[PDB]
Design a protein around this ligand. Sequence first.
Ligand code: SAH
Ligand code: ZN
Lengths: 20, 179, 163
Amino acid sequence: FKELDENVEYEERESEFDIE
Amino acid sequence: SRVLLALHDRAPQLKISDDRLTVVGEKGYSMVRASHGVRKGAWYFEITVDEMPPDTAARLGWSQPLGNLQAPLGYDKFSYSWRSKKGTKFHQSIGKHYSSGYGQGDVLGFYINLPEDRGSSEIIFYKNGVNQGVAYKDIFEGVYFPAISLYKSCTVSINFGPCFKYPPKDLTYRPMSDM
Amino acid sequence: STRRATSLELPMAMRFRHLKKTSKEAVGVYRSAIHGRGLFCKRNIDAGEMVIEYSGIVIRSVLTDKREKFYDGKGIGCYMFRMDDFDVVDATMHGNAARFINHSCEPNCFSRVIHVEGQKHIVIFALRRILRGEELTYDYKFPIEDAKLPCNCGAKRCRRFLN
Ligand SMILES: Nc1ncnc2c1ncn2[C@@H]1O[C@H](CSCC[C@H](N)C(=O)O)[C@@H](O)[C@H]1O
Ligand SMILES: [Zn+2]
C-alpha cells in the first residue's frame, strides 16, 4: 500500500454511490 | 407560507440563493428538499437547468424526509431521481434506463400521484413539456417533497407553481405552491 | 488598552507543521507482542507532545458503509478513522506509520481532532512520559457490537475485546 504525507481529499465521481 | 427550498433541510455545502429558488452544487452529490411535502393527490413542479458545465450532473425527483442529504437522490428507499446524464432513473441506487438525458437550458416537470383509497401511486417525468413515460409505480408510502441533488457546481432553478412554462397537457394536477 | 488572551490554536498550528520532521526522529515500526507490527518509541517522549498524525484519504462519512463492504468484502482490513460527523480518514490504501499503532485498554497515547488553517487532522498525543522503546498505543474507541474482536493489549483491567 502506498504511504501518504499529508491528508488527501478524495474526489468523488458521479457514480460513487451506484451499484454496478 | 411560501413553498421554497428548505432553510435547514439541506446539505450545508450547497449554495442556495437569497430567494431560495436556486441552488449551486458543491463537489460530491448532496441534496436539498423543499419546505413542503404531499401525501395525497396529484402534484407538480418544474426545474430549469440554469447552467450544466462539463462533468457536472443532477438527480432530480421526489424524496421522503428520511432521505440522506449527504448522498444523491434515489440513493435510499426514500427518494426517486432522474439523472441528467443518460436519463437514468434511480431508486435504492439501482440505475435503470428510463429516458433520454437532459442538460443545460431544459425545463423539467415532476408529476406525482398519491391517490386516495387502495390506489396505485406513480411518478412521471417531463422534459420541456414532453411526457417521458411512467418512471415508477406503487412507490414506498409516505410524504414526498420536491428534492434536488447536484453533483459538482451545476446550477438549477425550481418553480413550485402556480403557473409553469410547460404545463402538462395530458394530466390533471395541482401545483406544489398550493401547499 | 485592550486585554489579550493566549491563543492555544497558534502553537498547535506551529507544532503540527513540524510534526512530519518530528515523527521520523521519534517513532518506528517493529514486531508487537500485542499483534503483528506496531509503532514504537525511538526517543523519550513527553506528555502532551504530538507523536504523529493519522493521515489518509479523507472521504465523506456517508461513504463508510460502501467502503467497508468493499473492504471487508474483498478481505482487506478496516484502517478507517472517524474525524467528524461529516469526514472520515481512509488509511486503508494510503496512510502513514500511525496505522501500525495498536489498541490498548491501558493506552499511553490518545487521539484528538485538531484544526490547522481550515482543515482538521487526527493527531496522536502522549498521555504521559513515554520512555524509549515502549510501544505507542491509544484507545481505538470502536463502537460496541455483538457476537466480537478479542484484544491482546496484555494489561490488567483490559476490556477483553476491541469492541
Ligand atoms: N490489542 C489488540 N489485540 C488484538 N488485535 C489488535 C489489537 N490492536 C490492534 N489489533 C489488530 O490490528 C488491526 C489494526 S492495524 C494496527 C497494526 C497491526 N498490528 C498491523 O500489524 O497491521 C486491527 O484490525 C486489529 O485486528
Ligand atoms: Zn484490551
